Design a protein around this ligand. Structure first.
Ligand SMILES: [Zn+2]
Ligand SMILES: [Zn+2]
Ligand SMILES: [Zn+2]
Ligand SMILES: [Zn+2]
Lengths: 309, 69, 305, 62
């Protein structure tokens, strides 16, 4: 039974001692997102913010919420070139943006750099997961800087953040990354939400999302990590939040840690090396693509990329 | 014999699709427990309604249980 | 296949990439206990050490190993007064000591303070485990101080310790230094999984108690072992990582007081153990279980410790 | 065939002629939390168990 109005609740959140019907859950969700934003000063009221959108349940729900909160939320989708999956994610994201009035930017990896993520991985010598994340981070930051965005927002939630923290502790960062020269701020307005809560919002809002997951992350370690943390959450409501908050409040402030950033030789984006990880990756790729007749020898790639629409 | 038993229809999309049949006429909590599913990692949908663990599921209902992970 | 003699292995340890036969597993287990002991400076070679023994697979294995390693290992069993369990715990523990000619110290909870754990639970207004754990911690320390033991050893293993560390993080080690009124506390098995300790106990022919006390830690262990199943060695990396790479990087902060009732270490005016029994006697007198003139009078810590 | 003691004694019969690894998988028992004892020796997961073998599965969690 809903707390506020007494209609039948459609979401029950033991970890908060809270049950809500559709209407008042949706209202609560939008408000709690803004609370997480205010708490860490993630976004100035009504400012431009670049949202990473893959069409997944998390990023679309985030686009919706930031939009309803009066932020100038512009989506940025990266066509990773992973077959039918990438095509379906593009269509969902495009459809989402057009069914509303939301401005969408798109960067196509193959059309821009010549290769998709899996081919990028094979040639570079990186695990596909690694090459994907590296490409995503570099490109969304590049677009943000080029288009004058101060901040990028991602749809990472509590399960995601708690699993990354857990994995670190098992095999031995935060909600807000500050703005630096040539480097937009990175924030995570959904980091207090469990995956179930975000998905529940997406369903109740009526958002059509891409249900299928990325083909490469089939047996990811994070899945194992999430399952153990959620096994605890089942018997102990609120454990994941206590876990993540405990690290940010009690452990990391008491934790002694160890380098200034440099403009990359090629593209001029911040890095500790002579050349950033991204250009380090593509240099090898092109060099080995040329060396294996997968790319004409008399071509040169310009680092800068233009987003369309 | 489940074609003749005809228990309630459950579609597992975790994320790949799968149809199973489990006995209804009991709280969702029980059928999720029987299927070895963690309630904190799924959302159970019936028609156009999210269900809660206490909600009663009948023999004729069709449940879509979506993985949130 | 045993990595020492090539014969059929009776224990396989994926997390270590190690498989051994009965003979060489017992040898490896005993040697690995000593390694942990010297690496953490838990005990001096041949030193007197008070070992908590309940009869369970862990405490008896530990008592066995410390003895073989040439330590003066004296066991302390605390009769808790929990039905047939407590009766069989003592019987098992006593049997072990007799058949190996080892010294056993026994503190009967009911004979000492008037109540076993079950009634200790009802009268203290506290959970059984919490009442049980506090009594065990206090009494073990008391006997160690009184009998001039520098160090106390308990049989806590890798699963136990990993679960506690995990429990800490979810709700914000192996060597605890000695302090005035406070014996040193060491856990020589903290790198052994429960399966490995049980394997040793079984292969050694140690008859232990096959039942436990009638929890959070079970959830913790389950979550970690779920990880362990798919990532062999994760628990050890977890615990070892924290103790060796994280905690030394943690900022250091406290002085302990003497309890005005009993003289044993506490942060406040009167320790949690005395406050507990004082409350128990109060609620016992009203139930007419106790004479109105009785007063909880704990043995004061010897004025020379 | 297989007496479960987890930690309380309950005996249930299954079918051998298979590795112990799969028997525990069938019974849904985390192999890192139990010890399988046959006769007077312990068993590993690659150890095949034949029929008429009495298996005592001891709970390590304690
Ligand atoms: Zn409502
Ligand atoms: Zn660069
Ligand atoms: Zn051998
Ligand atoms: Zn005291």
């Amino acid at each position: 039974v809903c707390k506020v109005c007494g209609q039948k609740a459609q979401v029950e959140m033991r970890s908060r001692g809270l049950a809500l019907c559709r209407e008042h859950y949706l209202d609560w969700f939008v408000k709690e997102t803004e609370r997480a934003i205010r708490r860490h000063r993630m976004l100035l009221p009504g400012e431009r913010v670049l949202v990473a959108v893959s069409g997944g349940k998390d990023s679309l729900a985030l686009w919706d919420v930031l939009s309803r909160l009066g932020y100038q939320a512009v989506g940025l989708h990266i066509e990773l070139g992973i077959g039918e999956y990438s095509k379906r994610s593009l269509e969902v994201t495009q459809a989402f943006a057009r069914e509303r009035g939301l401005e969408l930017l798109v960067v196509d990896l193959k059309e821009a750099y010549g290769f998709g993520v899996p081919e990028l991985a094979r040639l570079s010598g990186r695990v596909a997961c690694s090459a994907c994340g590296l490409s995503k981070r570099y490109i969304i930051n590049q677009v943000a800087v080029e288009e004058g965005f101060r901040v990028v927002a991602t749809g990472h939630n509590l399960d995601d953040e708690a699993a990354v923290l857990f994995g670190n502790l098992l095999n031995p960062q935060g909600p807000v990354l500050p703005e630096k020269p040539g480097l937009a701020a990175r924030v995570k307005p959904f980091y207090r939400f469990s995956e179930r809560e975000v998905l529940s919002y997406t369903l109740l809002r009526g958002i059509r999302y891409l249900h299928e997951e990325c083909p490469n992350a089939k047996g990811a370690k994070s899945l194992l990590y999430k399952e153990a943390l959620n096994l605890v959450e089942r018997s102990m409501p609120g454990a994941k939040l206590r876990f993540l908050d405990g690290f940010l409040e009690k452990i990391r402030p008491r934790l002694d840690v160890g380098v200034a950033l440099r403009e990359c030789e090629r593209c001029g984006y911040p890095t500790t090396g002579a050349v950033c990880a991204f250009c380090r990756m593509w240099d090898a790729v092109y060099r080995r693509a040329k060396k294996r007749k997968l790319l004409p020898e008399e071509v040169s790639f310009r680092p800068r990329v233009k987003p369309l629409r | 014999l489940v074609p003749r038993g005809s228990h309630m229809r459950v579609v597992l999309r975790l994320p790949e699709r799968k149809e199973v049949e489990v006995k209804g006429n009991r709280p969702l909590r029980e059928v999720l427990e029987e299927l070895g599913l963690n309630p904190e990692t799924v959302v159970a949908v019936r028609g156009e309604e999210l269900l809660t663990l206490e909600d009663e599921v009948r023999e004729e209902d069709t449940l879509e249980v979506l993985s949130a992970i």
